[PDB]
């Protein structure tokens, strides 16, 4: 049969079929409900909206994310999103297809236990499997050795792998990702008199961040350049026709990744996190780890982030080591591509958690069979 | 059965049957009583006259409007007018027909409470409903999204609606409409030596306003043109054969809608009111609101008012927005047409306030069931 | 010398001298201009009126607030108000006194830049400083640890402080305050047939709100009590002798603070805002924050608001935490009292921005020296 690969991220849902080169369905992972009163009768109105239909009508809706920091917090909305993905986007029968799901490392066990329970009971899938997103990203690049830096909307994490072996004690997890950057940009936009307070306005700020933000190679030099002249300013048109102009915010927003103290976090930056993850591994594999830094996720798509990470890691690493950052242009879907590749492999077909095994063992079997 | 749609405006009464394309009965909402002494015996004389019979004999009558600024102030005369509408104009049995009534937004609650009480007790209707006039106007145009500018004889108001959802906090209400314009024209006609002081003469001034007034595209240029020559002057024949000539008054009278300060009001014009109502809505629906400005009411029938409103809103709106004014030729009866359409809908048949519900709950049920 | 403390709020101006226990001058921050025509010659008439003189003659004036939502929007009127405060109220020479000014957090930078420029150029003050209002309120209570809820006429904001250290990432700002409540009461007064439309009538509605509104401990029980009987009704006399009676509106008006959806806002209430601000701080300071909730501003003077906030925060906080609301009877002037205390401190005398520093650095120095 044909397996289903579903990457349930905090911000976007990636779904498709195993063997394909790109995900079939990509849409935001949101559920919207009306907050005003309906005075017009005879027209089709629904109590909830999911995905693009919620984005289109966001002006009269309150938008909620069921997944927060890679943890599912509203299982009703998550089930609604899964139903939407299975029926309206891919248009498939769930019980006729094994499904591969993704999860961030160091997550609560109950999250994947409930994922398995929902998949086996509500949708009655024949088989399912839960994988780590960082390993799938390594699969997508055709590599067996390297350290993967994956940063999406909720979670940023590092996983070092050498010759197909993972070192769990060196796994790092950070709760700073895209959504936090969007909130910080939303806060700092008030310096120029721009006020965004609603969940519909938050999406507008996210679009502005995606379309106008970049990572500066040197932060203080960029600050001086922005203070000296107006060559770095850009204009953006709001949906109602208003035009806003932003200056140093464009690179101030992504700077939080390297300086988490901008949002009040004591943790270190992504470069120092990667260096510490490398230094926790055996001395005989650090040289290979230094040359196989793999980037994945939407938050790694800022212009100039790879050069900045290269510079920082070079400044941290010994001068005789060769630092190489791997940033494929398609790294936005590396997790899904690796999941499809894994589901297409012949040797993986006996690693599926089947319905019989679940009926015998309960939801706890995902701990024994998956990682 | 067949539902009855009655639009009780400040100036005119519109009545008919649901499913019809036009109101069956249209007549002024006035009650007249003699003010001289009857010296002739043996002839049929009545203590009161309603509607067209009052208009025909206005020379010996004092005319009173029971509705003032969309608020009923004389319930005895209002009951007389309702009896006239039910029995002499439509010629129907009130207890055999559900009745749909209209009301302006931001009205006193006691007004509709007494309307419901009168309908259920005096006329013993089986069911009744009170709708908002601007919503019905939106129904008449076959739209679910737009901002409605309704201006009749007593009230001018704006109601923005998006995807069938109303935003009550953005609803505007103005107490400048046709009657105020008639009074202002009555006052300014004294500059040419014309004196109208009675309620019968006020009707003559209203006819003059309806037949000779228009909205100037640019007020000061029209002023200069009227001062330069006499190309804008028109002649009107009084009922007794006298002929009057008016110049700049023709467009001075409707100018009060855009400059309320002409009658001593501090409020802004209709264009600024519409712009402020649009700006109070969510940023993601303002573009659709800009292109769906719907006009309704008799006061919107001045020649050239739509172009003036388009110009003003374009001058107020951002240059990249598309401003479109919708002014149907039948907008004089948009409220009644929308009411008939709503009463003809199948899904509305369970929204009627029935006699049993009124007997159970009292007059206050109209607040819970209607809007 | 003697420093000047000026608290420029959206609704009122508080001014005086450092070291005093109360502000010397309190008057509304309004500028009024005549809207009728002057027909009497030989009498003293002015083109503008400021403060109490504008309030006294409001019947023939249009009233404008130069400050909107803590942001100065009319700098000419603001300069007129500053001139009035300096010369007619305090009767002092501006160049002989350093001046301390206040501002709300998360404000546009250009606002304080222009404030500094106006103070240094137009009035030629020797030194000036801009402080955050919530910090000054904490100064007034003799505390170094606590979370301050300040709500005036334009802005409501929360600032948590622990051991003299502020956590900027946990600062909350809300654009719902007294003026919005006045507008909502103005809108809901139409349910009883009372119509207030002018800026002079808006002041009357504000007086009614100040004199008759209170916060209900339980909203639905108060609704049921008001519906059952008339024990909650009060009477108010209009300036022309008319008497109005209001029922549930008295506590419906302040309820918008806890339910912003009454005016169409998606944001949460003040209690939930305070709880979220507390939860964003470090876990080791939340216990001290829970017991030091400080109220400040005119909008916190509603009867029963402190008990309602205590109940809500207790319902939100863990059952083992001790919730304490600090509501001094003089919290109406807490910002000014704290500003005077700060200006009287010996260690603050070197934090003044002096004329030499401004001449060297330009208006941008307020960003580097102030917070
Ligand atoms: N061009 C871009 N520049 C910066 N950030 C981006 C860009 N495109 C997407 N993002 C951000 O990436 C995040 C979503 O990416 P994704 O890896 O799909 O996250 P998740 O897997 O958590 O859904 C969002 O926060 C989005 O704003
Ligand atoms: N052709 C016209 N030009 C200008 N005003 C008109 C015209 N026809 C009617 N009116 C005015 O419209 C008002 C009544 O219209 P209508 O919408 O029926 O009001 P209502 O619903 O309050 O009775 C009256 O003031 C009348 O003078
Ligand atoms: N007793 C009261 N009850 C309720 N509101 C009040 C009371 N006294 C003053 N206010 C309101 O407080 C606001 C002004 O207080 P203030 O803290 O001086 O604001 P600002 O600093 O913005 O001028 C006004 O909206 C006023 O109506
Ligand atoms: Mg992801
Ligand atoms: Mg009408
Ligand atoms: Mg204040």
């Amino acid at each position: 049969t044909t397996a289903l690969v579903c990457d349930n991220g905090s911000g976007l849902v990636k779904a498709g079929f195993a063997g394909d080169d790109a995900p079939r369905a990509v849409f935001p992972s949101i559920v919207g409900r009306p907050r005003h009163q309906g005075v017009m009768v005879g027209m089709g109105q629904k109590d909830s909206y999911v995905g693009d239909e919620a984005q289109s009508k966001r002006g009269i809706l309150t938008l909620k994310y069921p997944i927060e920091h890679g943890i599912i917090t509203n299982w009703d909305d998550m089930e609604k999103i899964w139903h939407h993905t299975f029926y309206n986007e891919l248009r498939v029968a769930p019980e006729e297809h094994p499904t591969l799901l993704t999860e961030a490392p160091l997550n609560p066990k109950a999250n994947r236990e409930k994922m398995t329970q929902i998949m086996f009971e509500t949708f009655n899938v024949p088989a399912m499997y839960v994988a780590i997103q960082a390993v799938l990203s390594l699969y997508a690049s055709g590599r067996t050795t390297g350290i993967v830096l994956d940063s999406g909307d909720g979670v940023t994490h590092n996983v070092p792998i050498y010759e197909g072996y993972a070192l769990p004690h060196a796994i790092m997890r950070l709760d700073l990702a895209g959504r936090d950057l969007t909130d910080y940009l939303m806060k700092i936009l008030t310096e120029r008199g721009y006020s965004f307070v609603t969940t519909a306005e938050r999406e507008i700020v996210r679009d502005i961040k995606e379309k106008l933000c970049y990572v500066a190679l040197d932060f203080e030099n960029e600050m001086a350049t922005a203070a000296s002249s107006s060559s770095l300013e850009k204009s953006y048109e709001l949906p109602d026709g208003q035009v806003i102009t932003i200056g140093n915010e464009r690179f101030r927003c992504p700077e939080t990744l390297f300086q988490p103290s901008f949002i009040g976090m004591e943790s270190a930056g992504i470069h120092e996190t990667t260096y510490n993850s490398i230094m926790k591994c055996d001395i005989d594999i650090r040289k290979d780890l230094y040359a196989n830094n793999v980037m994945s996720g939407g938050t790694t798509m800022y212009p100039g982030i790879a050069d900045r990470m290269q510079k920082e890691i070079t400044a941290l690493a010994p001068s005789t080591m060769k630092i190489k950052i791997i940033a494929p242009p398609e790294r936005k879907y590396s997790v899904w591509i690796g999941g499809s590749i894994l589901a297409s492999l012949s040797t993986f077909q006996q690693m599926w958690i089947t319905k019989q095994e679940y009926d015998e063992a309960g939801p706890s079997i995902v701990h024994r069979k998956c990682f």
Side-chain angles (χ1 to χ4, degrees), chain A:
Chain A
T1 178
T2 304
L4 293 180
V5 181
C6 180
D7 186 12
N8 286 123
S10 298
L12 295 175
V13 174
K14 279 78 63 178
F17 299 86
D20 291 59
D21 44 64
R24 188 82 64 93
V26 179
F27 61 95
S29 175
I30 55 179
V31 175
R33 293 176 174 86
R35 64 190 191 97
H36 301 298
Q37 56 168 159
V39 301
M40 216 72 171
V41 317
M43 66 177 304
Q45 293 184 341
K46 307 183 301 180
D47 274 320
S48 302
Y49 301 89
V50 179
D52 294 321
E53 67 195 31
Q55 279 285 342
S56 59
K57 299 181 178 180
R58 65 190 184 189
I60 50 97
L61 302 172
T62 298
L63 304 179
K64 296 299 179 59
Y65 285 88
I67 297 181
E68 232 284 327
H69 287 319
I71 305 181
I72 301 182
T73 59
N74 196 333
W75 288 100
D76 302 329
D77 291 356
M78 196 60 209
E79 180 167 332
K80 300 156 75 70
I81 287 188
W82 273 327
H83 179 91
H84 179 82
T85 303
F86 275 141
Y87 288 96
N88 308 345
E89 301 297 80
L90 299 183
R91 316 189 74 89
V92 306
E95 70 281 328
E96 259 68 284
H97 301 264
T99 304
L100 174 58
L101 300 179
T102 67
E103 191 189 23
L106 300 175
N107 246 21
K109 300 164 64 270
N111 189 84
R112 65 167 53 191
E113 293 178 12
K114 294 199 222 61
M115 290 173 62
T116 301
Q117 178 185 286
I118 289 300
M119 283 301 166
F120 270 135
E121 303 194 309
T122 294
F123 301 101
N124 307 273
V125 299
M128 55 87 60
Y129 188 89
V130 183
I132 299 287
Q133 297 147 351
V135 190
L136 297 181
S137 299
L138 193 67
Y139 266 108
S141 61
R143 285 178 168 86
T144 59
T145 293
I147 171 173
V148 177
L149 177 63
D150 182 74
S151 186
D153 194 62
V155 183
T156 301
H157 58 277
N158 288 273
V159 173
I161 300 182
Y162 185 76
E163 301 296 331
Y165 291 96
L167 293 82
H169 63 94
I171 294 185
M172 303 294 192
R173 182 190 172 103
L174 198 70
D175 275 1
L176 205 167
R179 194 171 303 179
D180 299 312
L181 303 178
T182 299
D183 292 333
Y184 184 64
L185 180 63
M186 210 176 189
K187 185 188 74 66
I188 67 179
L189 278 178
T190 60
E191 304 179 0
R192 292 176 174 266
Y194 307 140
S195 181
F196 305 88
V197 295
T198 67
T199 58
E201 284 170 313
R202 175 174 286 99
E203 304 291 326
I204 299 179
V205 171
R206 175 192 51 82
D207 182 72
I208 297 173
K209 180 200 63 176
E210 295 184 6
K211 290 170 62 177
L212 288 185
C213 290
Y214 71 97
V215 176
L217 191 60
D218 186 295
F219 183 70
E220 296 299 326
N221 291 329
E222 213 74 15
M223 275 262 115
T225 302
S228 62
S229 61
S230 304
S231 59
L232 298 177
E233 289 191 350
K234 291 289 183 298
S235 295
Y236 183 89
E237 196 193 313
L238 295 184
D240 76 318
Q242 300 188 241
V243 178
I244 65 175
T245 304
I246 57 181
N248 51 10
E249 299 84 3
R250 303 175 56 196
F251 59 94
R252 280 176 63 187
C253 179
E255 187 66 21
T256 314
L257 291 176
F258 302 91
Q259 298 189 239
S261 61
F262 286 173
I263 60 179
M265 302 193 62
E266 187 183 89
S267 61
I270 53 179
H271 61 294
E272 293 164 317
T273 302
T274 303
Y275 178 74
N276 298 335
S277 179
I278 292 181
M279 292 303 301
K280 289 225 222 304
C281 299
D282 299 89
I283 190 178
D284 280 318
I285 76 178
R286 300 173 179 174
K287 191 194 66 57
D288 281 3
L289 291 182
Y290 277 140
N292 287 271
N293 298 39
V294 179
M295 284 185 173
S296 179
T299 323
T300 61
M301 295 298 299
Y302 289 100
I305 184 178
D307 302 325
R308 175 70 177 278
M309 279 287 296
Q310 170 106 32
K311 170 187 177 182
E312 299 295 334
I313 298 184
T314 300
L316 288 179
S319 60
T320 183
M321 291 288 95
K322 298 286 144 295
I323 309 299
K324 191 191 183 189
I325 307 297
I326 309 299
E330 72 284 352
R331 62 188 179 270
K332 214 167 192 179
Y333 303 132
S334 286
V335 176
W336 190 95
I337 293 178
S340 178
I341 293 183
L342 178 61
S344 299
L345 288 183
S346 300
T347 47
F348 179 78
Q349 302 303 310
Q350 296 303 311
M351 295 181 180
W352 291 98
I353 303 181
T354 65
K355 182 60 179 300
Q356 180 187 31
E357 307 172 39
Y358 175 80
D359 295 330
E360 292 182 358
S364 58
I365 190 182
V366 64
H367 301 331
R368 301 190 298 102
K369 292 214 60 175
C370 296
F371 162 69

